[PDB]
Write a protein that binds this ligand. Structure first.
Ligand SMILES: [C-]#N
Length: 153
């Protein structure tokens, strides 16, 4: 897990995200879809988007960006005491959404990318370290739930 100091770094970084949650969410999803087009195919309601201009222009995508990062933020604010919030997330994504576990890695790397893009010079080594640990914890606990269910079997 993370030390108290690391969680503080994580939640201080998350304040940057909360100043524009939609925009961070949009750019994270865009980064995921364009870097990993397979991921787009799992979203029936974004499959129609062919170009990054169309993605950028989609108001529904931004809105969904809010849904996604709200969910993540509430989990991060638990500082690892997240079983109630994380387990249903895991289960929904393994069963209903059919999301391969590796897609969590992809979005983790996208979050780091987008934080640097939007906050150049203001997302230091310490802060990236901490956020990376939190996203690892996140993936690791989701993976445990996936394993229960036999992944995408
Ligand atoms: C989930 N988007």
């Amino acid at each position: 897990g993370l030390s108290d100091g690391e969680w503080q770094q994580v939640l201080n970084v998350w304040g940057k995200v909360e100043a524009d949650i939609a925009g961070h969410g949009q750019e994270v999803l865009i980064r995921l879809f364009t870097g990993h087009p397979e991921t787009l195919e799992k979203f029936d309601k974004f499959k129609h988007l062919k170009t990054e201009a169309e993605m950028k222009a989609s108001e529904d995508l931004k809105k969904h960006g809010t849904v996604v990062l709200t969910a993540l933020g509430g989990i991060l604010k638990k500082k690892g005491h997240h079983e109630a919030e994380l387990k249903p997330l895991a289960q929904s994504h393994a069963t209903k959404h059919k999301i391969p576990i590796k897609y969590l890695e992809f979005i983790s790397d996208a979050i780091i990318h987008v934080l640097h893009s939007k906050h150049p010079g203001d997302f230091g080594a310490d802060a990236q370290g901490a956020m990376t640990k939190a996203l690892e914890l996140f993936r690791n606990d989701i993976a445990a739930k996936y394993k229960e269910l036999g992944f995408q079997g």
